[PDB]
Amino acid sequence: WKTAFYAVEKRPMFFEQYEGGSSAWCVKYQFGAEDGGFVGCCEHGRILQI
């Protein structure tokens, strides 16, 4: 798998108090991050089936 499939990380996890849409009695939070993944040369692995 060191060459069969790859993962890509773009920007790590961020959390934040979403300013606006929040009163002096209510607080709203928003978070996210960016990642993905693809297959390399998939001729480097066997998948056993029935």
Binding site: G21, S22, C26, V27, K28
Partner: protein, 137 residues
């Protein structure tokens, strides 16, 4: 060792399946609902909430029923279309499965629940009660 929790968080019938029962909530400062199923139902039954007022003909019997204006939470993305406050049990709830709910802000002295339109024949199975937890006097 079951203590007498009759006093100190009493309970009353809200909906038996045939008729409503307006219940006073004056003496208490907090309260909540309880739902129970008696048989598998066909649709996600809906219910309308109403609050009464002390009728000026007699300040002991409640007055008419008014629809209560639910206030949405800060991130209530989907809020009531025009049915200011209401509830809807999800479909595919079985017996021996109690359900819990409450409204955030009251506006009267009596609370009542009715089977909302189109869900009556399926509401003839669900039972609803109310629990109050205040003394205030």
């Amino acid at each position: 060792m079951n203590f007498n929790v009759g006093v100190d968080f009493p309970s009353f019938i809200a909906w038996d399946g045939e008729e409503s029962f307006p219940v006073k909530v004056d003496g208490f400062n907090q309260f909540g609902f309880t739902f129970k199923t008696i048989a598998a139902l066909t649709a996600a039954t809906t219910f309308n909430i109403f609050y009464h007022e002390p009728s000026d003909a007699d300040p002991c019997v409640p007055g008419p029923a008014i629809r209560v204006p639910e206030v949405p939470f800060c991130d209530t993305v989907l809020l009531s279309e025009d049915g200011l406050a209401a509830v809807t049990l999800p479909e595919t709830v079985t017996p021996d499965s109690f359900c819990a709910g409450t409204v955030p802000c009251m506006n009267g002295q009596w609370i009542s629940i009715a089977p909302a339109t189109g869900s009556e024949t399926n509401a003839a199975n669900v039972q609803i009660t109310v629990t109050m937890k205040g003394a205030t006097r």
